[PDB]
């Protein structure tokens, strides 16, 4: 029993970890789709020049 | 996750033997003691009969 309460909390622990990694990777998504919008305001510069 | 599973762990360590074990093994040397026991009887029978 004592065993199988340390994997429990393995597995806690393992599930903390990944729901951080989540922030993390949407973060991530966000700087990105920035890019794409700075991608277009360069394009509309060139229009403009 | 890393604290908690060193803690379980050490705790786990230092503890080591608990009481039921000890009470484990000496009732079997006990009852090896007890086993042993009964030769002089035995013999003690065989001669009188």
Same mark, same amino acid.
């Given at each position: 029993?004592?065993?199988?309460?340390?994997?429990?909390?393995?597995? &806690?622990?393992?599930?903390?970890?990944? /729901?951080?990694? *989540?922030?993390?990777?949407?973060?991530?998504?966000?700087?990105?789709?920035?890019?794409?919008?700075?991608?277009?305001?360069?394009?509309?510069?060139?229009? %403009?020049? | !996750?890393?604290?908690?599973?060193?803690?379980?762990?050490?705790?786990?360590? /230092?503890? &080591?033997?608990?009481?039921?074990?000890?009470?484990?093994?000496?009732? *079997?040397?006990? %009852? %090896?003691?007890?086993? *042993?026991?009964?030769?002089? *009887? !035995?013999?003690?029978?065989?001669?009188? /009969?």
């Amino acid at each position: 029993r004592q065993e199988w309460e340390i994997q429990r909390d393995n597995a &806690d622990g393992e599930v903390k970890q990944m /729901d951080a990694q *989540l922030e993390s990777l949407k973060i991530r998504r966000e700087a990105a789709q920035m890019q794409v919008e700075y991608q277009e305001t360069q394009q509309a510069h060139t229009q %403009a020049q | !996750s890393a604290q908690n599973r060193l803690e379980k762990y050490q705790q786990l360590y /230092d503890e &080591d033997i608990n009481h039921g074990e000890q009470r484990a093994m000496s009732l *079997l040397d006990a %009852a %090896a003691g007890q086993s *042993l026991a009964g030769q002089v *009887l !035995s013999i003690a029978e065989g001669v009188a /009969d």
